[PDB]
Swiss-Prot record:
The gene is SMYD3. Residues 270-425 are annotated as: C-terminal domain. Histone methyltransferase activity strongly stimulated by HSPCA. The keyword Kinase does not apply. This is Histone-lysine N-methyltransferase SMYD3.
Length: 425
């Protein structure tokens, strides 16, 4: 017997609930993806299988688009790449939308693949599509995806025979919109997209009681506070650095619902998020469109230059609690880490600590990882009392959000032991 179950909610479809009390940090479920792919910005920078960045990737010789860190990865990937390769070679110097490559892999994984453990609680067939809530604009976008898919797969899929029993491509793309997980690497960089149908049972809250974390493509679902018997299990679908208006847009546009959580009812934190001079934060918000695109493509030198122009502007500056300023600091910190500018990374990272304490309350994996980054930076600069405080705090968080089953916890424990050797009596 599991400690959770599927149930029919009153007004939000199916959900997952606790069938026994759960404690912070408890592992509730784990899953490989039904299907996944590298995301657009990371294609060619990270390995298509393990989603790690390496100096050197080796191209699939047959398509020259899918890239691997190693023979191990090419071989472990081949069953699930074998049918899409031809399709990728034809389209370049051009490339299908991530959703299309993802659905291609679902369609092959269904037909060709043994049944998937990712579907133990809920299957692809069961996923919500929200078809009766889609607007005309969204339906038009789905129709285009269907046409794109039919072109991409004409190579490997011409008729009903190669698509699953009673398969409707329009409905399948509708499912992909509201059930696609962004896969993040250990450093919380977005690197892939996948389907995890059992995890798609979880409804959303802006103040959730569970969290997911990724270790490569593998997903761990954990409780992040005490949960009572019968309580519905929730995760936050969204970035924490968002006002309630911003959250409302994304939840409507992507998920077709109106959030009734208490944070949305109270507009919790909205005004604190937008402190400082409007002329400046409006312009920073605009600049972040470019900065975030550059970051998604791992263009660190360009990210850093744009961020430095803001952080160290000759013109007016923002408080670090302003969410747009905060996002700029965090992009700059990650750019510096990746460029080996570790002193500079620490200045920006340390500035994010208190805002992150405020905006990622309780135990949130993104805060755990940020605090760990800052402690690591301090450790390697010989700032041992500071590092030890931060590494301990990171562990406080990550023992709950990541747990022993996540490899990053082993890395963190090594840092703690290293630092302790310098501060111990
Ligand atoms: C990933 S699925 C979650 C499981 C879903 N309820 C089902 O029956 O398959 C996402 C969809 O669940 C619904 N949903 C999730 N969180 C919600 C919430 N807090 N309030 C209302 N509907 C919600 C929406 O239909 C949304 O598009
Ligand atoms: O069924 C689904 C699909 C889905 C996707 C996400 C999701 O990918 N959220 C992202 C993660 C990276 N930062 C921005 C927000 C979170 C929860 C969820 N449940
Ligand atoms: O095996 C099982 C299945 C199961 C279901 C539930 C259950 O449905 N609990 C309710 C939900 C609403 N509030 C009060 C509690 C509670 C306990 C339990 N043990
Ligand atoms: Zn690899
Ligand atoms: Zn190939
Ligand atoms: Zn909400």
């Amino acid at each position: 017997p599991l400690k959770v179950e599927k149930f029919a909610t009153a007004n939000r479809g199916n959900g997952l609930r606790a069938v026994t009390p759960l404690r912070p940090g408890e592992l509730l479920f784990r899953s490989d993806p039904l299907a996944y792919t590298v995301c657009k910005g990371s294609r060619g920078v990270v390995c298509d299988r393990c989603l790690l960045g390496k100096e050197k990737l080796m191209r699939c010789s047959q398509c020259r688009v899918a890239k691997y860190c190693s023979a191990k990865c090419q071989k472990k990937a081949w069953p699930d790449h074998k049918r899409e390769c031809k399709c990728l070679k034809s389209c370049k110097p051009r490339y299908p939308p991530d959703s299309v490559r993802l659905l291609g892999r679902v369609v092959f994984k269904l037909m060709d693949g043994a049944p998937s453990e990712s579907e133990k609680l809920y299957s692809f067939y069961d996923l919500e599509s929200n078809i009766n809530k889609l607007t005309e604009d969204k339906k038009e976008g789905l129709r285009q995806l269907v046409m794109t898919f039919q072109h991409f797969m004409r190579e490997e899929i011409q008729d009903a025979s190669q698509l699953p029993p009673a398969f409707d491509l329009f409905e399948a793309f509708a499912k992909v919109i509201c059930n696609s997980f962004t896969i993040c690497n250990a450093e919380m960089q977005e690197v892939g997209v996948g389907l995890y149908p059992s995890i798609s049972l979880l409804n959303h809250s802006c103040d959730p009681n569970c969290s997911i974390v990724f270790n490569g493509p593998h997903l761990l679902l954990r409780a992040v506070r005490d949960i009572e018997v019968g309580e519905e299990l929730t995760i936050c679908y969204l970035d924490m650095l968002m006002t309630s208006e911003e959250r409302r847009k994304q939840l409507r546009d992507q998920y077709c619902f109106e959030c009734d959580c208490f944070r949305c009812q109270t507009q919790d934190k909205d005004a604190d998020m937008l402190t400082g001079d409007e002329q400046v934060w409006k312009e920073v918000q605009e600049s972040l469109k470019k900065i975030e695109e550059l970051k998604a493509h791992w263009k660190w030198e360009q990210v850093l230059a744009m961020c430095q122009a803001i952080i160290s502007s000759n013109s007016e500056r923002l408080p670090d609690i302003n969410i747009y300023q905060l996002k700029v600091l965090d992009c700059a910190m990650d750019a510096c880490i990746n460029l080996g500018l570790l002193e500079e990374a620490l200045f920006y990272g340390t500035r994010t600590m208190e805002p992150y304490r405020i905006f990622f309350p309780g135990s949130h994996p993104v805060r755990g990882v940020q605090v760990m980054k800052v402690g690591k930076l301090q450790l390697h600069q010989g700032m041992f009392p500071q590092a030890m405080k931060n590494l301990r705090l990171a562990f406080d968080i990550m023992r709950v959000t990541h747990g022993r089953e996540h490899s990053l916890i082993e890395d963190l424990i090594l840092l703690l032991e290293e630092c302790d050797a310098n501060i111990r009596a």
